[PDB]
Each structure stands twice: as C-alpha cells, then as structure tokens.
Amino acid sequence: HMKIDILDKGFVELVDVMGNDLSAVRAARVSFEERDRHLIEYLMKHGHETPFEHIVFTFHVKAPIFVARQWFRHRIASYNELSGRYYEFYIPSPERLEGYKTTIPPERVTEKISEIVDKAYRTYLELIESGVPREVARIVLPLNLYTRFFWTVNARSLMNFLNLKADSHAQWEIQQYALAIARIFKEKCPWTFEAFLKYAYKGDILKEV
Amino acid sequence: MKIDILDKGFVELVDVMGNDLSAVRAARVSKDEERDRHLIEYLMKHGHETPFEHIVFTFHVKAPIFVARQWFRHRIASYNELSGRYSKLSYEFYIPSPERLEGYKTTIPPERVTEKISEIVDKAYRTYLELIESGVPREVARIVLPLNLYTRFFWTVNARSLMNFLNLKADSHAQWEIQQYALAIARIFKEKCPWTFEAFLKYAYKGDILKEV
Amino acid sequence: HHMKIDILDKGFVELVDVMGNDLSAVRAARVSFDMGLKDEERDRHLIEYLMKHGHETPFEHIVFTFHVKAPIFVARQWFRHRIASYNELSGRYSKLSYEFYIPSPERLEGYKTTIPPERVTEKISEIVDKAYRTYLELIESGVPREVARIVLPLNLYTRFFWTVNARSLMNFLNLKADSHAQWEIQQYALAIARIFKEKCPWTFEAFLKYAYKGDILK
Amino acid sequence: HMKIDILDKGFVELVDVMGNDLSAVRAARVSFDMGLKDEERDRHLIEYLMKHGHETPFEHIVFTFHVKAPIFVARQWFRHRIASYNELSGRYSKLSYEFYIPSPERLEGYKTTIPPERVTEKISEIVDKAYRTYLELIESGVPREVARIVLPLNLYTRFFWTVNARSLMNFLNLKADSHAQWEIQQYALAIARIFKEKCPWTFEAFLKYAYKGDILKEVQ
Ligand SMILES: Cc1cc2c(cc1C)N(C[C@H](O)[C@H](O)[C@H](O)COP(=O)(O)OP(=O)(O)OC[C@H]1O[C@@H](n3cnc4c(N)ncnc43)[C@H](O)[C@@H]1O)c1[nH]c(=O)[nH]c(=O)c1N2
Ligand SMILES: Cc1cc2c(cc1C)N(C[C@H](O)[C@H](O)[C@H](O)COP(=O)(O)OP(=O)(O)OC[C@H]1O[C@@H](n3cnc4c(N)ncnc43)[C@H](O)[C@@H]1O)c1[nH]c(=O)[nH]c(=O)c1N2
Ligand SMILES: Cc1cc2c(cc1C)N(C[C@H](O)[C@H](O)[C@H](O)COP(=O)(O)OP(=O)(O)OC[C@H]1O[C@@H](n3cnc4c(N)ncnc43)[C@H](O)[C@@H]1O)c1[nH]c(=O)[nH]c(=O)c1N2
Ligand SMILES: Cc1cc2c(cc1C)N(C[C@H](O)[C@H](O)[C@H](O)COP(=O)(O)OP(=O)(O)OC[C@H]1O[C@@H](n3cnc4c(N)ncnc43)[C@H](O)[C@@H]1O)c1[nH]c(=O)[nH]c(=O)c1N2
Ligand SMILES: O=c1ccn([C@H]2C[C@H](O)[C@@H](COP(=O)(O)O)O2)c(=O)[nH]1
Ligand SMILES: O=c1ccn([C@H]2C[C@H](O)[C@@H](COP(=O)(O)O)O2)c(=O)[nH]1
Ligand SMILES: O=c1ccn([C@H]2C[C@H](O)[C@@H](COP(=O)(O)O)O2)c(=O)[nH]1
Ligand SMILES: O=c1ccn([C@H]2C[C@H](O)[C@@H](COP(=O)(O)O)O2)c(=O)[nH]1
C-alpha cells in the first residue's frame, strides 16, 4: 500500500516484503526487544552484513531509461522490465538547472528537450504505421523514455544501492529514486535503517534529508 | 511446516514472500487462474526463469557438515550458520542406520558399521570435551570432530535458484543424505507454489526422484 | 590474445584478454577425482562428458575480457547478464561522439512497408541528426552533460569492457544467439561465439553438440 | 608456478592470472572515453579508484589458485560466493592420510592444564583412529561417501579457486584479519603475497586506502 511519485511521471511502489528487523535477528542467531535492537546496531557496526540478506523487498518502479541503466548495474538483485520489442518521457523542470550558468534560460532548455521528445515520438509512430517493426522503430526514442520494472532485492543489497545512489555524486534523478527507496526501507525496517545511517551508510544525502 | 530428516536433521520453513502470482505479476510488470497457470507453464517451457526470482523462501536447516558443504556450494542464495569458534558444540552426529548400507555387499554386518561409526564419533567427542576443559580454545579443539557433526543454518533462496538446487540435489546421482533434504525442500516448495512446482516437474526439472514421489 | 570483429555499421567486439583454455576446465574437473591432466583423447572426451551431463562449474575457470562497441538498446539487453563484470562509457562524464546505429535498407527484408526501406533509413538518420545537434547546443549553453544527453536516442553507440567466464558466456549464447532475440544482438552473439570457438575449440564444439539451446549457430 | 607452503601440509599455488594493474586502468578510463596514458598517470588513477571506492574496474583482473587446506578452513573460505570453486570429492576419491596437526606453538598464548605437546598428540591419536576406521570401512565395501563421515575436520582437501581482484580484496578484508581464525589468516597471507606480486600498484593502493583488516599492514 505504499507508492511515492518521483520526477514528473515516475514512481516507486512497494509490491511485497519478506521479514522485518527481526528476520535479521533470527538469522544472526540461527534461531526460529532492547536486546534485539542492540544486536541490530551491533551487526551493523561490525560490518556483519549477511543477516540483512534475509529481509527482501519487491518494488515496482517507473523510471526513465537513463535512470534504469544506472539502476540495473546493481547485479545482486532480480529485475523484470517492460519490453520495447513487445509512451511518456521525463521532461526536467527549469529548477533542474538552477545552480548552473546557462547561456539559454532554464525554461528554454525544458522546451528543447520537450521538442525532441515530441519529434522522436512522432517519427517512431510514423515508422510503426509504415510497417516498420517495433523493435526497429523504437531505436529513435530518447533516453528519457519512461520504462517500468519489478525489482526484488534483499536489505543488504538495498543498503549497497543506497550507499552509491543516495549520494550527491550520483545523478540527481536517481538520488530522488534512492530517497523513495530509503523511505520505504525505513518504514519496514526502522531498526536496521536507523543503525545503517548511524554506522554503515557511506553517502551524504540521507543524513541531510 | 517442519520436516524431520535423517536421524536429527530437519528442514523448517521460516518465511516466504509471494506465491505463483508473484511470478505472474513480474513477468507482466503490473488473478485469472487458467490464464496465469498457462503463463507459468509458458515461462518454464521457454526457459524464461527470471520471473520466478521474485518468490523467495527462508528455511532453517539442521544437517551434518558433509551435507552442508554440498549445500553451501549453491552460491545464488543467502546463508547464516552456527560457529564453530563461538559456541560449545552439541553431541549431535549423523550415525547411519544399518538400512543405509544393507543393499551393499559388505564383509561385516551393516549393524557393526553403525557401531564402528558411533564408537569413533564418541571417541572424537570425548577428546574434544577434554581439550575444551583443558583450556584449548574451541576453534582449535573442534578440528578433531568428524564430518557427520550436525550444524544449523538459515537459508534464504528465491524460487529460481531453489529449482536449480532441486535439479542437482533431488537426483539419484547426488548423495542419498542430501536427496532426503531435497525431498523436504520440494514438499514445502510444492505447498507454497503448486503451479510453479507442477510446471517445473513438467518442463524444466532435470532430476529423477521428484517424479517418483 | 587479440581479435576484433566489426558488427552493424560502426560497432565491434574485440577480445582484450583471456585466462585459461579447454585444459583449464579439464584440470578443474579432474581435482574431484584427485587427478590432473591426462592425454588429448581422454581430456577431450572429458570436456564432452562434462557438457553432456550439465557439469558446468569447471568451465567457470575460463575467463574472457571483451571491449564492445554497441548501441544502447543492445547494451541494455546485454547488461541484464548479471554474472559478469562491466565498465562503460559515461554520458555523465564524457561528451558523446556523433555515432549512431543506422540500419541499412536490408534490415527491413520481408517486411511490407508503406515507404521504401531507404526512406526508413533516412528518416532514422534525420531524427538522430536532430537529436544530436540539440544535445550539442544544450552542451554549448552550459547544460550539464548528464542532463543534455537525455535527448539522445537508443541507437547511440556506447563502449564497454565485459569480463565473463565460459559458463556465463554459454548462458549468454543460449539466449542471444537465437532467432527469437533481436537481430542486432544476434549479430554481437555471433561475434562472441566466433571468438569463443577460436580460444576454446573443444568446449565450443561440445557446447554446440550437447548443450547449446539456440538455433543460429548451426 | 608460485607455490607457498602453509601449515604442515598446506599450500596456495598460483595457477593462472588474467590482466594486471593496467587492466583496471583501461576499464576505468572507458568511462571518460579514454584508454591508457602513462606510468605515473595510470598508477595515480589506481590510487584514486581505491580512495574513492570505485571497485568495479578491479573485476577485470582475475586469478586462479590451487589450494590445499583443512576442511574447517575450506568451509570458511567457500562462504565467499563471488568466486568459482572445484574441489576434491570424498564421494569419488579414496582420501589420503593428510591431516592438519597444530604445532605446540599454536597453543601457547593460552593457559592449559596439559602441556601443548600433549594437545598435539591427543589430536594425532584421534586422527589416526578415525583414519584407520575409515580405511576399515572402505575395505569392507562401505561406499566411500559414507565411510568418509568419520574423518575429522582437520582433513586436508584441495580445490581450484578462480576469483577476480575486487572479490579477492573482499576476501583479504575478512580473512587477513586478527578476528579470523589463525589458520585461515595464514592462507590469506600467501594469497596477499601472490596478489602483491602480480598487481603491485593495486595492492599498495588497497593497503593505503581500502583494506579493513589489520595484519597485512604489519606482515610484509
Ligand atoms: C528473446 C529474449 C526476450 C526477452 C529476454 C531475453 C531473451 C533472450 N529477457 C531477458 C531475460 O529475462 C534475462 O534478464 C536475461 O536473459 C538474463 O539471463 P540470466 O538471468 O540467465 O543471466 P544472468 O547472468 O543474470 O544469470 C546467469 C545465470 O545465473 C543465475 N542467476 C544469477 N542471478 C540470479 C538470481 N538473483 N536469482 C536466481 N538465479 C540467478 C541463473 O541461473 C542464470 O542462468 C527479458 N527480460 C525482461 O525483463 N523483460 C522482457 O520482456 C524480456 N524479453
Ligand atoms: C572473522 C569472521 C567471523 C565469521 C564470518 C566471517 C569472518 C571474516 N562469517 C562469514 C560471513 O557471514 C560471510 O558469509 C562471509 O564473510 C562471506 O562474505 P561476503 O558475503 O562479503 O563475500 P561474498 O563473496 O559472499 O560476497 C561479497 C560481496 O558481494 C555482495 N553479495 C554477494 N552475494 C550477495 C547476496 N546474495 N546478497 C547480498 N549481497 C551479496 C556483498 O556486498 C559482499 O560485499 C560467519 N558466517 C556465519 O554464518 N556464521 C558465523 O558465525 C560467522 N563468523
Ligand atoms: C556516482 C557514481 C558514478 C558511476 C557509477 C556509480 C556511481 C554511484 N558506476 C557504477 C558502478 O561501477 C557499478 O556498476 C554499480 O555501482 C554497481 O555497484 P556494485 O557492483 O557495488 O553493485 P552490485 O549489486 O553489482 O554488487 C554489490 C556487491 O556485490 C559484489 N559483487 C557483485 N558481483 C561481483 C563480481 N562479478 N565481481 C566482484 N564483486 C562483485 C561487490 O562486492 C559489491 O559490493 C559506473 N560504472 C561504469 O561502468 N562507468 C561509470 O562511469 C560509472 N560511474
Ligand atoms: C551429483 C553431484 C556431484 C558433484 C557436484 C554436484 C552434484 C549435484 N558438485 C557441485 C557442482 O560443481 C556445483 O558446485 C553445485 O552443483 C552448485 O551448482 P550451481 O553453480 O548451479 O549453483 P549456484 O547457486 O552456484 O549457481 C546458480 C546459477 O547461477 C549461475 N552462476 C552463479 N555464479 C556463477 C559464476 N561465478 N559463474 C558462472 N555462472 C554462475 C549458474 O549458471 C547456476 O545455474 C561438485 N563440485 C566439486 O567441486 N567437486 C565435485 O566433485 C562435485 N561433485
Ligand atoms: O534479448 C533480450 C531482449 C530483452 N532483454 C531485456 C532488456 C530490458 O531490460 C528488457 C526489455 O528489452 P527490449 O529490448 O525493450 O525488449 O528485457 C534482454 O535482456 N535480452
Ligand atoms: O555430490 C556432491 C559432491 C561434492 N560436492 C561439492 C561439495 C564440496 O565442496 C566438494 C566435495 O564434496 P564431497 O561430498 O566430498 O563429494 O564438492 C557437491 O556439492 N555435491
Ligand atoms: O571466521 C569465519 C568463521 C566462520 N565462517 C563461516 C563458515 C561456516 O559456514 C560458519 C561457521 O564456521 P566456524 O569455523 O565453525 O566458526 O561461518 C567464516 O566464513 N569465517
Ligand atoms: O552515475 C552513474 C554513471 C554511470 N553508471 C553506469 C550505468 C551505465 O551502464 C554506465 C553509463 O552511465 P551514464 O548515466 O551514461 O553515466 O555507467 C552508473 O551506474 N551510475
């Protein structure tokens, strides 16, 4: 029952979850509450990370392909994505360029991106209408095309994701997705998430937001 | 759901995320029973196995170390095991019963084999306890303990990699001892994912024993 | 070790390094029985034996590094193979060259199309040209590259290194060297198989005969 | 082949290796649409990658080792899943009379109410007994896979290990560390020594910036 909107048309939604902070506690003890919290912080502070592999999430994510390509680099997880063989685009708002000294107003940049999207999309449609197969015609669509996928990932792998994506060195667009993931993660695994931030999280932005 | 295995072993279900429909939701990126089972068979038939990765199990398993070592070779999974260095170890060992060996032509009664194995276990254990009480640390004293010592672990595994495990272990070329664990894993799996299990047996299962049970 | 195969108009697969060979698998399998290498007949026989019974772990000790140039829509299909290592050209950090996969008119064989295949090719070029010049002007106005590149189409060429062991490479071939896979990636898979054949003749023959699931490699 | 003896009958032996320090430089440079530069430039990128946590470029360096080690050691080792293993089988082979017998020096450091050499002989006695029983079981037609269960955890096994440099570093972090059992520390020292020999720059940079363990910053 948890969806977060990201960018102009994207989202992250929680599809399912196995376990909670106690799943990592059982695993670390190999047995089927102030003590439990303490073991959580204890595991986290000593980098005993494998217990956290026994908490698992499945997300449904709508994201632009350029964001998805960074995301899918995370190999310790499962993905199923929408197929372009078998249509909406991320248009940055003007604010995206604030802090940059551009020769053309931020609003004009937005418009040019939006113009290319429009032109590429119409080329695609015309190709399809010509009888060009989809797998060929879609190649003209830009990297800001929205795709969707299911992402299944354990809490350990998700921490690693947060380390590298919830960080000002990461592209701002994916950091937004990472913040949504962290928020869901915090909801479901408050003890682990709190210990993670305190002892093991390597990025900067979840300390600031 | 807990199943006894061998003399002191068990496979116990701790948790599961999803069911056959999780694999359907994922293949479609989004319930109609006949259509959804059909998709299941279609995925399994054409080897499109990633959707089954979105079903996941956690088990708690108690097994002898010679069995755990065969098990732990399956890398696409998560493990937490008892140590070893940090616990005093229980007097628990797999001693095969005479039925394990009847069938084999042996020059001594099957029962005397049981007795011989028991005797050595008992001696190893005594040595261990002696070294323990003498101050030798556990991590050193336990090296005298035989491979039939029972250990316990938590095993977290998705339905795709579990199917791989069943391919390899639910099979008469695998050691009899681990076959028995696989039969219990197959039962829990069938109970939680009947459609995936049936489609697996029908289309992708490479072993021999699961279609006998 | 070095090989290079050109693919599509401007792509390639280049072999950068390799560890091991058919005998690497033979040795690793042999340790099971407390044995090492034997002789050519027996060792070749063993490779086939391993392949027939699906004993795939010994082939993990054969390892390749490729340097691949490919359009993003192909790279995206390729990078779904998780049991492997990648490093790729960055659109955030580098300024991208004008290189796009333009399909030739023949790519449309057996399709009845409304406009001549040549027009499709030229329509694809036009949109590409337009998207690219927009990217350049965004870059020139001080737009960061990571934003500017979002207007670039899926047929932009990217480059990457791919390190992959023989087992995982066989898994790749089963799925990509197959007529249900998109033609463009089938072409890269053919190049991959060709290099694999060259460096591991026995494994490769054995794979084709006993295990390979696709159709295009026959 | 680089082969280093460990414990009383143990060894770690380099079988093969793909790539070198410059393999990581090449992989990293592709991000900036670049290749190799020169000596002092490329060594500095190695340091830079390690200092900032860019680990993936080190995946393109790969090693194969042949390791002989006690089963209690292999069991800890094999927990490292991002690697490839093939091991001697007690199902398919008649096992050799080779067991790890700790030297008396393994025990000083600890107060014991029996002398360390007594500990050493108590271990041998149990090994001898178990091994003789094993042979007797085999001799009676007890199949190997069953007979071997009486053999103690200190039995030597052998395996091939193929592992990339990033995952080798993870291994050094965990096993070349005083918290790991002394026996496996010793293997991890040999591993480190071969690593260092093949990839001197990656290795120095790893010690300087990324290595979490304690012992490799003191054992040469
Ligand atoms: C013709 C055609 C058409 C499509 C697709 C492929 C092909 C060939 N795919 C891709 C497919 O779903 C899959 O993502 C890739 O083929 C990757 O294959 P593996 O997972 O086998 O390789 P990968 O290298 O990921 O795995 C290699 C082997 O490791 C194992 N493995 C690795 N990680 C694992 C894990 N976490 N759990 C369990 N086992 C694991 C598996 O046993 C696998 O055989 C797809 N995808 C999609 O999302 N949507 C689509 O519409 C399509 N369409
Ligand atoms: C001193 C000491 C003491 C102990 C243990 C280790 C050490 C060093 N361990 C072992 C520990 O729990 C762990 O299993 C091993 O260190 C394997 O380590 P990695 O998973 O980091 O390596 P591995 O090669 O398995 O993985 C390496 C890297 O890949 C990632 N990764 C790989 N597979 C993954 C997956 N499926 N999910 C998420 N991320 C994944 C991780 O990010 C990790 O950094 C243990 N174990 C135990 O069970 N009981 C015990 O009592 C002890 N005691
Ligand atoms: C800010 C920023 C900037 C960039 C990049 C990331 C970030 C955050 N990256 C991506 C990076 O190189 C990498 O692909 C992803 O971060 C995935 O990281 P992991 O391998 O940690 O996750 P993944 O989920 O793949 O693995 C998690 C853990 O498992 C282990 N592991 C898994 N598989 C392994 C294997 N085969 N070998 C060894 N260890 C393994 C690692 O120990 C890791 O800690 C990149 N990439 C790029 O190619 N070019 C670029 O220019 C950039 N730029
Ligand atoms: C009857 C019998 C007899 C034996 C053995 C097994 C069985 C069933 N084995 C074990 C066998 O070699 C192997 O270790 C296990 O079957 C684990 O198999 P997977 O690699 O499929 O599981 P795992 O979970 O390791 O892999 C799951 C899937 O992921 C893929 N994958 C994961 N990691 C990969 C990687 N790094 N590279 C490429 N692909 C990867 C594979 O495609 C695989 O299907 C063995 N072993 C041995 O050493 N000596 C022996 O003598 C024997 N004897
Ligand atoms: O042969 C294929 C075809 C698609 N995929 C993957 C790549 C993407 O993550 C999705 C959708 O790819 P598409 O090319 O749009 O059909 O599936 C693949 O891995 N291999
Ligand atoms: O049937 C087998 C035999 C061996 N293995 C693996 C487990 C160990 O790492 C080695 C040796 O196991 P063994 O039970 O000794 O045959 O190979 C296995 O997974 N399955
Ligand atoms: O120091 C250690 C101790 C245990 N492990 C792993 C190996 C086994 O699965 C368990 C228990 O090992 P033990 O040596 O019994 O403490 O944890 C490890 O990787 N490193
Ligand atoms: O910040 C980044 C940059 C690149 N990557 C990965 C994702 C792609 O495979 C390549 C190219 O990414 P790019 O967004 O073009 O910089 O590197 C990433 O994961 N995170």
SS3 per-residue string spanning chain A: CEEEEECCCEEEEEEEEECCHHHHHHHHHCCCCHHHHHHHHHHHHCCCCHHHHHCEEEEEEEEEHHHHHHHCCCCCCEEEECCCCCCCECCCCHHHHCCCCCCCCHHHHHHHHHHHHHHHHHHHHHHHHCCCCHHHHHHHCECCEEEEEEEEEEHHHHHHHHHHHCCCCCCHHHHHHHHHHHHHHHHHCHHHHHHHHHHHCCCCHHHHC
Partners of residue C128 in chain A, C-beta under 8 Å: 140
Instruction: From A206, A202, A209, A188, select the one nearest A52 (Cα to Cα).
Output: A188
Q: How far is residue C142's CA from residue C148's CA, in Å, rounded to a whole number?
A: 9
Q: How far is residue C118's CA from residue A130's CA, in Å, rounded to a whole number?
A: 13
Q: How far is residue D86's CA from residue C198's CA, in Å, rounded to a whole number?
A: 25
Phi-psi region of A99 (alpha: psi -120 to 50; beta: other; left: phi over 0): left
What CATH number matches the domain at C1-218, 3.10.20.90, 3.90.1200.10, 3.30.1360.170, 3.40.50.1980? 3.30.1360.170
At residue D114, φ and ψ (nearest 5 deg) are -135, 145
Q: How far is residue A22's CA from residue A16's CA, in Å, rounded to a whole number?
A: 17
Domain boundaries of chain D, sorted by first residue: 1-220
- CA C27 centroid distance within chain: 28
B69 lines ligand 6 (CB under 6 A): yes
Resolution given for this structure, in angstroms: 2.1
First to last CA, chain D: 21
DSSP assignment, residue D210? I
Can you read off the two tokens belonging to residue B170?
Answer: 């639910």
Contacts for B118-125: CB closer than 8 Å, 24+ residues apart:
B119/D133, B120/B146, B120/D129, B120/D130, B120/D133, B120/D150, B121/B93, B121/B95, B121/B146, B121/B148, B121/D150, B123/D126, B123/D129, B124/D126, B124/D130, B124/D152, B125/B91, B125/B93
Would you say B158 and A152 are in contact if contact means Cβ atoms under 8 Å apart?
Answer: yes
Please return the burial class of C215, using the count of CB atoms within 10 Å of its CB with bins 0-12, 13-18 and 19+: exposed
Instruction: From B144, B140, B142, select the one nearest D123 (Cα to Cα).
Output: B144
Q: Which residue has the tokens 């170390």?
A: B65
User: Angle C183-199/C166-176 helices, nearest 10 degrees?
Assistant: 150
User: Under 8 Å CB-to-CB from D71, ≥6 apart: which residues?
Assistant: B69, B147, D153, D154, D155, D156, D157
- Strand order, beta sheet including B56-64: B2-5, B9-17, B56-64, B150-158, B78-81
Can you read off the two tokens belonging to residue D58?
Answer: 């080190």
* Pairing between β-strand B150-158 and β-strand B78-81 as defined by DSSP bridges: antiparallel
User: Under 8 Å CB-to-CB from A21, ≥6 apart: which residues?
Assistant: A36, A37, A40, A55, A189, A190, A191, A192
DSSP assignment, residue B146? B
Instruction: From C83, C56, C75, C91, select the one nearest C13 (Cα to Cα).
Output: C75
Q: How far is residue D60's CA from residue C85's CA, in Å, rounded to a whole number?
A: 7
Would you say B100 and B118 are in contact if contact means Cβ atoms under 8 Å apart?
Answer: no
Q: How far is residue C168's CA from residue C174's CA, in Å, rounded to a whole number?
A: 10
- Strand order, beta sheet including A78-81: A2-6, A10-18, A56-64, A146-154, A78-81
3-state secondary structure of D80: coil
Q: How far is residue D129's CA from residue D149's CA, in Å, rounded to a whole number?
A: 13
Residue A19: closest C-alpha in chain B: B15
Beta-carbon neighbour count of residue D23 at 10 Å?
24
CA–centroid distance, residue B52 to ligand 5 (Å): 17
Which method was used?
X-ray
- CA A15 centroid distance within chain: 14
Q: How far is residue A15's CA from residue A17's CA, in Å, rounded to a whole number?
A: 7
At residue B77, φ and ψ (nearest 5 deg) are 180, 175
Q: How far is residue C64's CA from residue C199's CA, in Å, rounded to a whole number?
A: 10
- CA D90 centroid distance within chain: 21
Please return the burial class of C39, using the count of CB atoms within 10 Å of its CB with bins 0-12, 13-18 and 19+: exposed
C167 lines ligand 4 (CB under 6 A): yes
Q: How far is residue D86's CA from residue D101's CA, in Å, rounded to a whole number?
A: 25
Q: How far is residue C63's CA from residue B163's CA, in Å, rounded to a whole number?
A: 26
User: Which of B85, B116, B130 has its CB closest to that of D133?
Assistant: B116
Would you say C166 and C62 are in contact if contact means Cβ atoms under 8 Å apart?
Answer: yes
Cross-chain Cβ contact D126/B131 below 8 Å: no
First to last CA, chain A: 23
- Determine the atom of ligand 4 nearest the C-alpha atom of C32: 51
How far, in Å, are A205, C99, C102, C134, C158 from residue C128 at the CA level? 37, 9, 9, 10, 15
User: Under 8 Å CB-to-CB from C83, ≥6 apart: which residues?
Assistant: A75, C164, C165, C168, C171
Q: Which residue has the tokens 């010592």?
A: B149
Q: How far is residue A28's CA from residue A44's CA, in Å, rounded to a whole number?
A: 11
Beta-carbon neighbour count of residue C37 at 10 Å?
12
Instruction: From C203, C187, C195, select the one nearest C162 (Cα to Cα).
Output: C195
3-state secondary structure of B213: coil
Q: How far is residue C175's CA from residue C189's CA, in Å, rounded to a whole number?
A: 9
Would you say D71 and C11 are in contact if contact means Cβ atoms under 8 Å apart?
Answer: no
At residue B152, φ and ψ (nearest 5 deg) are -130, 145
User: Angle A21-29/A34-45 helices, nearest 10 degrees?
Assistant: 80
DSSP assignment, residue D5? E
Instruction: From C71, C123, C74, C134, select the one nearest A125 (Cα to Cα).
Output: C123
Would you say A85 and A137 are in contact if contact means Cβ atoms under 8 Å apart?
Answer: no
3-state secondary structure of B57: strand
Beta-carbon neighbour count of residue A41 at 10 Å?
17
Residue with the smallest CA separation from ligand 6 atom 18 is B70
- CA C129 centroid distance within chain: 26
Would you say A8 and A18 are in contact if contact means Cβ atoms under 8 Å apart?
Answer: no
The alpha helices in chain B, defined as continuous H runs, are: 20-28, 33-45, 65-71, 110-133, 138-141, 159-169, 176-192, 194-203
Which amino acid type is present at position C169?
Answer: L
User: Kindly report the CA angle at B149 between D180 and D112, in degrees rounded to 5?
Assistant: 55
3-state secondary structure of B86: coil
Please return the burial class of B140, using the count of CB atoms within 10 Å of its CB with bins 0-12, 13-18 and 19+: buried
Q: How far is residue C79's CA from residue C86's CA, in Å, rounded to a whole number?
A: 8
Q: How far is residue C120's CA from residue B49's CA, in Å, rounded to a whole number?
A: 36
Partners of residue D146 in chain B, C-beta under 8 Å: 96, 100-101
What CATH number matches the domain at A1-209, 3.30.1360.170, 3.20.20.80, 3.10.310.10, 2.120.10.70? 3.30.1360.170
Instruction: From A116, A21, D20, D126, select the one nearest C152 (Cα to Cα).
Output: A116
Interrupted backbone of chain B, residues before each interruption (C–N > 2.5 Å): 30
Can you read off the two tokens belonging to residue D168?
Answer: 């080798």
Sign of the Cα pseudo-torsion (C151, C156, C157, C160, in order): positive
Q: How far is residue B71's CA from residue B66's CA, in Å, rounded to a whole number?
A: 9
User: Under 8 Å CB-to-CB from C129, ≥6 apart: which residues?
Assistant: none
At residue A150, φ and ψ (nearest 5 deg) are -105, 140
Q: How far is residue D12's CA from residue D65's CA, in Å, rounded to a whole number?
A: 7
Please return the burial class of A194, using the count of CB atoms within 10 Å of its CB with bins 0-12, 13-18 and 19+: middle
Residue of D1, D13, D33 to mutate when probing chain C, most C C-beta within 10 A: D33
Class of domain B1-213: alpha beta
- Min Cα distance D185 → chain C (Å) is 24
Please return the burial class of C218, using the count of CB atoms within 10 Å of its CB with bins 0-12, 13-18 and 19+: exposed
Can you read off the two tokens belonging to residue A5?
Answer: 């909107």
Q: Which chains share 3+ C-beta pairs under 8 angstroms with D?
A: B, C
Q: How far is residue B114's CA from residue B97's CA, in Å, rounded to a whole number?
A: 6
Residues 6-65 of B with CB under 8 A from A: 12, 14-18, 22, 25-27, 29, 50-51, 53-54, 56, 58, 60
Residues 165-194 of D with CB under 8 A from B: 181
At residue A70, φ and ψ (nearest 5 deg) are -65, -45
CA dihedral C108, C110, C115, C118 (to 10 degrees): 40
- Strand order, beta sheet including C3-7: C3-7, C11-19, C63-71, C157-165, C85-88
User: Under 8 Å CB-to-CB from A99, ≥6 apart: which residues?
Assistant: none
Instruction: From D63, D57, D62, D59, select the one nearest D25 (Cα to Cα).
Output: D57
Instruction: Please give the full DSSP string across chain C, using - where no structure is assigned.
Output: --EEEEETTTEEEEEEEEE--HHHHHHHHHGGGT-----HHHHHHHHHHHHHTT--GGGGG-EEEEEEEEEHHHHHHHTT--SSEEEE--TTTSPPPS-B----GGGGTT---SS-HHHHHHHHHHHHHHHHHHHHHHHHTT--HHHHGGGSBTTBEEEEEEEEEHHHHHHHHHHHSSTTS-HHHHHHHHHHHHHHHHH-HHHHHHHHHHT---STT-
Class of domain D1-220: alpha beta
- CA C79 centroid distance within chain: 9
Can you read off the two tokens belonging to residue C98?
Answer: 């004008």
3-state secondary structure of B43: helix
Contacts for B105-112: CB closer than 8 Å, 24+ residues apart:
B105/D141, B106/D140, B106/D141, B106/D142, B107/D139, B107/D140, B107/D141, B108/D140
